[PDB]
Amino acid sequence: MDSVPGSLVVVGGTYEPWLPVLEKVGWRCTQVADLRKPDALFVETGPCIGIVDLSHDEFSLNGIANLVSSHKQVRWLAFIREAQLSSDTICQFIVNFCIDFFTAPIPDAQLLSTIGHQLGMLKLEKKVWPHFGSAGNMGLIGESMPMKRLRDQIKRIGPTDVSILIYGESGTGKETVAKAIHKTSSRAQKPFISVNCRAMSEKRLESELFGLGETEEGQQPFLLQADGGTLLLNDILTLPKSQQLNLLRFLQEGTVETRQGVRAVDVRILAANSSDIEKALIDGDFNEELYHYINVLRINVPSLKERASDIVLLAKHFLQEYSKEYNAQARSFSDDAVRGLTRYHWPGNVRELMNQIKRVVLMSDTVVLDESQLDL
Amino acid sequence: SVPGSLVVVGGTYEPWLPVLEKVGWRCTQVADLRKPDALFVETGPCIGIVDLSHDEFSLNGIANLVSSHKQVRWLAFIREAQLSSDTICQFIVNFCIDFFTAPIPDAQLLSTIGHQLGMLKLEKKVWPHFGSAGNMGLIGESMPMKRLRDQIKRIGPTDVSILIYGESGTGKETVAKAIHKTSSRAQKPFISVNCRAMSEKRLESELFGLGETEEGQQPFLLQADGGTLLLNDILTLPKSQQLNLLRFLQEGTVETRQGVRAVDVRILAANSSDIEKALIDGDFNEELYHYINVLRINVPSLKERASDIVLLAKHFLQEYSKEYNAQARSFSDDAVRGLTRYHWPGNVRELMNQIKRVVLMSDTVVLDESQLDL
Numbered sequence: 110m111d112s113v114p115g116s117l118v119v120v121g122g123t124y125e126p127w128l129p130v131l132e133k134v135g136w137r138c139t140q141v142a143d144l145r146k147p148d149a150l151f152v153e154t155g156p157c158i159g160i161v162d163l164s165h166d167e168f169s170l171n172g173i174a175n176l177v178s179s180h181k182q183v184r185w186l187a188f189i190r191e192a193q194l195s196s197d198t199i200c201q202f203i204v205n206f207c208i209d210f211f212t213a214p215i216p217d218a219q220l221l222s223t224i225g226h227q228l229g230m231l232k233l234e235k236k237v238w239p240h241f242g243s244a245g246n247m248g249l250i251g252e253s254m255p256m257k258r259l260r261d262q263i264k265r266i267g268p269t270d271v272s273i274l275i276y277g278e279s280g281t282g283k284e285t286v287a288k289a290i291h292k293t294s295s296r297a298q299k300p301f302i303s304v305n306c307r308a309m310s311e312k313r314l315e316s317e318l319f320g321l322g323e324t325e326e327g328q329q330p331f332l333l334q335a336d337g338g339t340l341l342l343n344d345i346l347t348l349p350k351s352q353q354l355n356l357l358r359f360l361q362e363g364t365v366e367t368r369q370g371v372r373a374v375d376v377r378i379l380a381a382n383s384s385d386i387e388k389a390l391i392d393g394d395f396n397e398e399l400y401h402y403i404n405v406l407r408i409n410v411p412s413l414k415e416r417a418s419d420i421v422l423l424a425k426h427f428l429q430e431y432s433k434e435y436n437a438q439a440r441s442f443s444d445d446a447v448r449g450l451t452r453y454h455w456p457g458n459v460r461e462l463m464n465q466i467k468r469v470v471l472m473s474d475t476v477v478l479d480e481s482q483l484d485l
Numbered sequence: 486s487v488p489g490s491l492v493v494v495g496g497t498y499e500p501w502l503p504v505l506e507k508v509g510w511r512c513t514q515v516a517d518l519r520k521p522d523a524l525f526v527e528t529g530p531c532i533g534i535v536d537l538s539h540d541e542f543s544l545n546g547i548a549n550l551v552s553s554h555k556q557v558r559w560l561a562f563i564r565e566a567q568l569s570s571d572t573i574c575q576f577i578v579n580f581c582i583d584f585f586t587a588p589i590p591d592a593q594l595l596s597t598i599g600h601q602l603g604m605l606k607l608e609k610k611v612w613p614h615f616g617s618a619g620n621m622g623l624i625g626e627s628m629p630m631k632r633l634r635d636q637i638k639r640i641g642p643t644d645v646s647i648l649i650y651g652e653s654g655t656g657k658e659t660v661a662k663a664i665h666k667t668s669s670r671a672q673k674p675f676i677s678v679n680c681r682a683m684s685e686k687r688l689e690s691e692l693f694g695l696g697e698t699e700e701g702q703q704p705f706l707l708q709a710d711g712g713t714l715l716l717n718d719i720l721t722l723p724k725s726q727q728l729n730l731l732r733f734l735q736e737g738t739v740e741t742r743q744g745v746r747a748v749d750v751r752i753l754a755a756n757s758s759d760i761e762k763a764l765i766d767g768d769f770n771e772e773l774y775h776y777i778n779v780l781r782i783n784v785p786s787l788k789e790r791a792s793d794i795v796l797l798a799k800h801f802l803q804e805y806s807k808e809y810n811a812q813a814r815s816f817s818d819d820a821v822r823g824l825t826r827y828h829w830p831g832n833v834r835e836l837m838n839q840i841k842r843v844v845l846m847s848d849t850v851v852l853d854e855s856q857l858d859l
């Protein structure tokens with residue numbers, strides 16, 4: 110036979126009754142007491158099933174609900190066991206999903222019925238859980254301390270095919286982030302379309318949602334191509350009213366217009382921002398309904414000003430990359446030069462950095478790059 | 486009364502429907518995808534089945550709705566034709582509790598639902614009431630308020646830590662006082678904390694205590710024991726204090742002059758800033774964040790509630806006018822079609838403050854638009 114382990118947290122060992130009914134029917138039972146232990150146990154066991162002994166007992170109700178959605182999220186299914194207390198706050202605490210509960214006696218055959226419904230999910234969890242982004246894709250442009258948070262954040266919000274708001278300062282790598290969560294999105298093998306729109310006129314911009322290729326003159330709406338995959342919208346607030354309409358229409362109906370008949374698609378939508386969004390909102394300028402459609406999740410891309418310990422490593426890569434790309438003899442920075450570039454403010458962040466270095470490298474006549482050839 | 490919704494444009498996929506209809510359940514069905522959103526945001530606690538059957542809706546918009554703000558108030562559930570389990574099994578990241586096989590064990594589906602239906606029957610403990618079972622809306626009463634009411638009613642009693650978010654000057658503490666009423670510790674003391682204007686050393690002297698207090702000293706937790714403590718402008722906390730906070734948040738213990746002791750305090754926190762920006766930059770311990778972000782509540786600014794502006798100003802008028810004998814008794818329609826049009830960055834606070842100012846200047850009984858923002 111083949112099955113899946115399952116743990117249970119309780120100080121009262123003698124509270125077996127429901128335990129041997131599962132071991133004999135084939136369940137890998139594990140039991141924790143001291144409250145702090147199961148966290149490590151749950152984070153190491155991976156996807157499983159946990160039973161919560163509520164029978165008055167001795168646990169902090171805050172810490173409980175905390176654990177419930179700490180990192181033990183979808184990968185863990187909630188379930189409680191109580192001594193018949195459905196009345197006060199305690200049963201209102203079953204707002205934490207919990208799927209079902211346990212009568213104080215032993216609903217012998219009913220117990221499997223309660224459990225059996227959920228079992229299809231754990232064997233489903235195992236099919237999707239191994240992934241883990243194995244290759245440790247060290248933020249394909251940066252790697253420091255605020256960055257590791259970003260990875261973890263990106264890794265857990267990636268697969269969730271919801272719309273996410275990406276915000277940070279200009280030239281930080283919001284697009285770089287967008288491309289990264291597309292790999293995580295589980296629609297990774299599908300196309301990805303970043304769009305530095307800006308330099309588009311309404312007519313031409315409007316030509317994206319319903320087209321103005323009069324007669325099939327080699328023209329296809331952008332939304333269409335991004336079907337199954339991911340589309341990115343850059344500098345979004347610059348959008349005109351009429352197009353924001355079509356977006357919300359599309360965001361609600363998922364349909365687009367083509368000359369060869371109106372059609373529907375399946376595109377996960379992302380958005381980037383660097384401006385004071387709230388200031389636009391209050392005046393009336395931005396449709397708030399649309400904001401709630403997109404602000405389902407937020408991710409903040411930290412500027413170079415935030416990280417600073419990244420500045421050195423970034424320059425090295427940008428050195429290596431551009432020097433190798435153009436055969437340049439420049440291969441290293443002096444300790445002098447290193448101990449100066451970080452002090453710069455870098456308003457344009459990642460963008461400006463590569464751009465600046467790009468120039469210096471193509472101007473660099475030496476192998477070691479001094480401060481004289483840089484910020485001048 | 487009866488929840489039980491299911492989303493699909495077609496219909497002939499009854500088979501699992503009459504098993505509910507014939508057993509006596511009012512099933513409700515949505516098609517145009519956009520409609521259930523408004524429906525889900527207004528219905529409150531219920532159960533929704535998402536029929537996707539590999540021929541229905543775009544999984545982005547779906548997962549969006551599923552996790553827009555329709556979170557705990559709704560339990561997820563899907564329907565597929567077996568011949569489908571493949572590309573997006575990951576959409577079951579939203580709990581979803583269970584799914585629907587193509588074979589239909591007529592009794593098993595009821596077994597899956599009936600056990601889960603009992604959880605919705607727990608929501609019945611507050612009995613939806615609709616008609617504002619609280620203090621007329623504590624401070625407001627419009628459309629985002631009724632959700633807020635519904636929201637407060639179901640997340641209130643749960644003595645877990647909750648993160649309160651809205652814009653500045655909205656009335657976040659008023660909510661805490663309001664949800665404390667729903668809590669099972671209502672008869673206990675309540676202590677608000679404006680964490681904005683406090684120094685580290687003195688802050689540390691509030692928890693486990695510091696300084697050199699060989700005189701007279703008593704911690705908030707002690708006073709707040711059994712009751713509820715609220716933290717306003719929480720992100721303003723220094724590193725060293727967030728440490729001590731988490732210490733308590735894990736152990737529930739404090740230090741006092743008369744020896745160290747432990748307590749049982751439900752903890753709340755208020756915020757008006759960009760929460761996502763603080764965590765990533767490093768300013769707030771994320772571990773600590775999950776201890777408090779167990780539940781979220783969104784306090785709607787005046788920008789959302791345009792129909793509240795009229796009702797809000799009137800209430801604040803009567804109360805303060807009476808307090809200072811003011812002759813002012815009403816607003817002109819002129820003033821009305823100006824107060825609503827205003828942006829109100831400071832929201833409820835600013836509204837209360839401005840009117841408060843005007844009243845002390847109002848020499849007339851009728852208040853015209855000229856006497857307002859002055």
Ligand SMILES: Nc1ncnc2c1ncn2[C@@H]1O[C@H](COP(=O)(O)OP(=O)(O)OP(=O)(O)O)[C@@H](O)[C@H]1O
Nearest residue numbers: 279280281282283284285305343344381382460463
């Ligand atoms: N016209 C362009 N052509 C080719 N590559 C470009 C162009 N513009 C930017 N890039 C590349 O984008 C990469 C980084 O992504 P990006 O600049 O979009 O991040 P971002 O600045 O945070 O996003 P945003 O577009 O919102 O400003 C840079 O390495 C740059 O080479």
Ligand SMILES: Nc1ncnc2c1ncn2[C@@H]1O[C@H](COP(=O)(O)OP(=O)(O)OP(=O)(O)O)[C@@H](O)[C@H]1O
Nearest residue numbers: 652653654655656657658677717718755756757834
């Ligand atoms: N000791 C106190 N106990 C109970 N209530 C108090 C006490 N002191 C003040 N209050 C009231 O609590 C409210 C707190 O105002 P506050 O500025 O914190 O609201 P807020 O909108 O949540 O703040 P913020 O703009 O930082 O978000 C005040 O209106 C005040 O009347």
